Symmetry: D2
Subunit: 243 residues, 4 copies
Amino acid sequence: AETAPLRVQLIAKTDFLAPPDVPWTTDADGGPALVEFAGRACYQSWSKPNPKTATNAGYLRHIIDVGHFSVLEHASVSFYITGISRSCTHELIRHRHFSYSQLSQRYVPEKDSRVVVPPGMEDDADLRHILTEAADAARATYSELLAKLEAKFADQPNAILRRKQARQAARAVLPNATETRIVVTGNYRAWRHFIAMRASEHADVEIRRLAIECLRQLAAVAPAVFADFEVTTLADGTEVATS
Amino acid sequence: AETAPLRVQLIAKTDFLAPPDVPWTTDADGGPALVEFAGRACYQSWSKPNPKTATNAGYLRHIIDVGHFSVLEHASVSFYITGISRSCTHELIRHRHFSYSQLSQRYVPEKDSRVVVPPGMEDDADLRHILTEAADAARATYSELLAKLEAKFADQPNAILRRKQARQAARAVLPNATETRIVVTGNYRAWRHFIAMRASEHADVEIRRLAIECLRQLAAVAPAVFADFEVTTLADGTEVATSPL
Amino acid sequence: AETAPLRVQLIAKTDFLAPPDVPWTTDADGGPALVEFAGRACYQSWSKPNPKTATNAGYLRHIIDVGHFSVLEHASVSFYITGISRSCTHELIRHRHFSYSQLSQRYVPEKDSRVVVPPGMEDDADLRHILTEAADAARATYSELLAKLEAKFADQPNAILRRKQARQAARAVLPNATETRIVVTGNYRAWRHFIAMRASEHADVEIRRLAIECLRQLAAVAPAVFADFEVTTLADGTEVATSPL
Amino acid sequence: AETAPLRVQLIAKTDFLAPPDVPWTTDADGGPALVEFAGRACYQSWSKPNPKTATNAGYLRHIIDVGHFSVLEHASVSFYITGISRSCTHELIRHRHFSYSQLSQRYVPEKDSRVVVPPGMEDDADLRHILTEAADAARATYSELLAKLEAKFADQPNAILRRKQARQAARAVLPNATETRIVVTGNYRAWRHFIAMRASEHADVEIRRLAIECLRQLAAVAPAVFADFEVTTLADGTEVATSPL
Ligand SMILES: Cc1cc2nc3c(=O)[nH]c(=O)nc-3n(C[C@H](O)[C@H](O)[C@H](O)COP(=O)(O)OP(=O)(O)OC[C@H]3O[C@@H](n4cnc5c(N)ncnc54)[C@H](O)[C@@H]3O)c2cc1C
Ligand SMILES: Cc1cc2nc3c(=O)[nH]c(=O)nc-3n(C[C@H](O)[C@H](O)[C@H](O)COP(=O)(O)OP(=O)(O)OC[C@H]3O[C@@H](n4cnc5c(N)ncnc54)[C@H](O)[C@@H]3O)c2cc1C
Ligand SMILES: Cc1cc2nc3c(=O)[nH]c(=O)nc-3n(C[C@H](O)[C@H](O)[C@H](O)COP(=O)(O)OP(=O)(O)OC[C@H]3O[C@@H](n4cnc5c(N)ncnc54)[C@H](O)[C@@H]3O)c2cc1C
Ligand SMILES: Cc1cc2nc3c(=O)[nH]c(=O)nc-3n(C[C@H](O)[C@H](O)[C@H](O)COP(=O)(O)OP(=O)(O)OC[C@H]3O[C@@H](n4cnc5c(N)ncnc54)[C@H](O)[C@@H]3O)c2cc1C
């Protein structure tokens, strides 16, 4: 078995086009620009009237301070995440205010599928080897089942739909550690709650790792929106994020 | 490996208590009655002038026919589902207007988990034994890894954590076919969409058989809300449920 | 001219049916029994070694304490709220994890529509008078508009269509304070977040007054789920509700 | 009364950034490009075997025909909308898969608020005048209530609170036609749904106009995504937008 490392790639974000017949500007671009525009539209306060918050960064900080998170919802970011385990995405997709598109084992052949090594095993050659040996055996069963199910279903003339009927049964044997790939789209508020929830000590370590990497890259895009999240290291080497 | 048959059990539904100061009654109770009530509340239409919508099934079929699906959201039904695979719940949970509570592999020991047999191999002792032996191996490996991770994490003084730390990693080798158990709650509208999506000929046969089973149980609770669905057989012996709506 | 008092009628709640072959019982039924079952199903733990959590209330307490809110979603309550203003419902409906069925001004005559007096002027009869009379003027204008519209639209031979087309323009003049009526269904979690946002001090007094009323009826049927909330009186003399959770 | 015309301005769309270690490219950018990527990521179908769907538009059209709407959810558009009534936005916020930031009446000066003329009376000077004169009246009655309400709360030292507390009761008398302004964000799936519901013959003409205008600006951004909707005209001379899906 080959192993797959976590890669999170930002592929989409908000293009803000400010409306001309409104008399306002701000030190920000894109999603953070839009969020300010939306909170200000709420009071038609286009003149920067509380000079404390006359910066995008200061305005956004204030919204987070008062708990008016709905304005955060206007801006969105998409990621393409590879090297994520099946079991990890099984936890991820419980978060219902995201949109998702995911590699499907019903359509995509998995005989060369890679595995994602749990973080608890990353530093142990014996454990990793046990895992990959077990994954190799599962892929061989998957190919043995695929071929026999294809024979069994030979009288289905749509070859495509046959393949699928076979594949979806044969994937029965693939382990949780099998690598998946997924596009995840979330608005700032959806992202904040996901990080709050999955970057805590309580969360499984794989999804914690993902959450923290998301925070890292989201903080690059909307520094003010995510500034209250604090990346600490724990007694056991792993990272957590908290507000 | 022991195998697990799908079992869907209705564990909750709506209990409707008509407000007694609304000059209204109908030939039904529960979810179905709430739905007629909510619809009539939109138009304050308590007296029932049209005989075609004078009964509860008549009113509901009209609600469906005219697309007023919002009113269907007030009534719900809960199910406890067992003998469902992990891969199948992994499709189920993509539906975002349901509420879910699920057996966690982080908390529940899986040394002796049952396997769920893909419907396409249910009737074939050979394929089943290939899957069951591969699962037996995967659990054996699971157990090996667990003892080792518990050793590896022995310096974690909270034994509850420790086992959690071990289990959540050991489970890496557990297969898609591993049984899970889940409680799923949806309002009627959520269920209709679930049936439409996952009871079609394009869905995996496992989720599809779940869809059809929930449908048939929901149809017993609320015949008028689900009646537009027709269960129908395929070239290959499997079923679909579809609606012209 | 006729003023509307807040009235809130519990019209629906959860009916629970424990599945037979699961060795667990509890000192509860309905919603709060469902929620315990949901939570236990996660750990497949049906026993009661701990007197803290050996009852429904203590178990529900604990689920709330650790913040496993998901389990609260399985159980629902529906109210029929009459005597709430249009502007108020316009705030209510921003809560997106509720389901709604509302009296439409497009279909229901508003000739004799009642108004809801803002609570910040309930006592001062002077201000009341300036409201009631401003509304009578708006009702008169709506009836004038409706008549002219119906007559303008006389060649729409479909009489229900004419009326709809006429009322939906005529209602332009009806004030914010006009009564509406509305069924609202939320799961225990939705309610908890509503009560928590709209029963605070920072919330408008009319919606606050709805929240606390919802709270007290939710406590009558699911006490442990909502026990952590406390109604206190503010400097104003108006009630608010809070919990440190 | 000033009378505001509907105005819809596209203030946000999606910026797409192809990931360079994926062997794929397409004849498009932004939203439409993200959606294809999301669809192809599902099957890892990066090379493009079929010529019929080898273009961005051919691919998107095929996503719609097959009903895979999940994938439309990755891209969104935000609008700032003015010249929309309160009655209209009160219909609009029934849509729960949208994000809203609306001008508040508890906080913003309604002393000289503009009014929106219902489309049903737009072309009749007699009816418009009735509306705008009822409006003028109403804004007169609102001052009476405001200035007198601040006075009943002289005892409260917090000024900006005191103002808020007086408006919140004073807007009771403001009418449904009163202009509001709102930022509305949704993904392509959510837009399609709004258009299907509110561009229909059954919807109020004011929201219908809004929906057709949004349809127009969305169709420019992402033509393949909105191509199934045709705008036709009913016998009464009002527009509808319908799709066969
Ligand atoms: C200690 C702990 C243990 C847990 N154990 C388990 C377990 O064993 N098994 C299991 O299946 N789950 C368990 N959960 C829940 C699980 O971890 C999921 O992550 C969680 O249910 C999904 O995230 P979320 O609840 O915040 O909902 P999300 O889908 O992420 O929703 C985000 C926000 O939207 C709102 N929302 C979304 N849908 C609804 C709804 N329909 N009704 C009301 N509000 C809604 C909520 O307010 C929520 O804050 C546990 C949670 C905790 C804290
Ligand atoms: C032929 C086909 C192939 C597919 N292939 C794949 C695939 O390979 N990989 C993959 O990941 N998915 C695939 N999908 C989508 C997938 O199968 C899921 O069933 C679907 O994503 C979940 O159901 P739903 O999208 O209707 O969402 P649900 O959550 O069940 O939606 C319920 C309703 O709520 C609304 N809704 C919920 N959330 C939103 C939101 N964020 N924005 C707007 N509306 C919302 C929608 O209108 C929807 O009808 C495919 C779909 C089809 C039809
Ligand atoms: C101090 C303050 C001032 C405000 N001022 C204004 C104003 O001027 N104008 C205005 O229009 N609004 C304003 N709001 C917002 C408004 O008051 C509403 O209460 C709010 O928009 C709706 O309630 P909710 O945010 O709890 O979302 P709800 O619909 O009640 O949903 C509750 C839960 O579901 C989640 N959820 C639902 N949809 C999404 C989504 N798409 N993305 C992520 N999570 C989601 C939320 O995260 C939350 O966890 C203000 C709020 C505050 C606190
Ligand atoms: C002919 C007709 C008459 C109507 N009359 C009235 C009336 O008099 N009074 C009134 O209040 N309403 C009435 N409605 C409903 C109303 O017009 C609103 O537009 C509608 O309630 C909001 O749009 P939506 O229902 O698609 O929900 P949206 O919030 O737009 O949802 C979009 C999608 O998400 C899904 N979704 C969102 N929330 C849930 C949920 N909780 N459960 C399951 N799925 C969900 C749905 O599947 C839906 O397809 C009427 C509708 C029709 C067709």
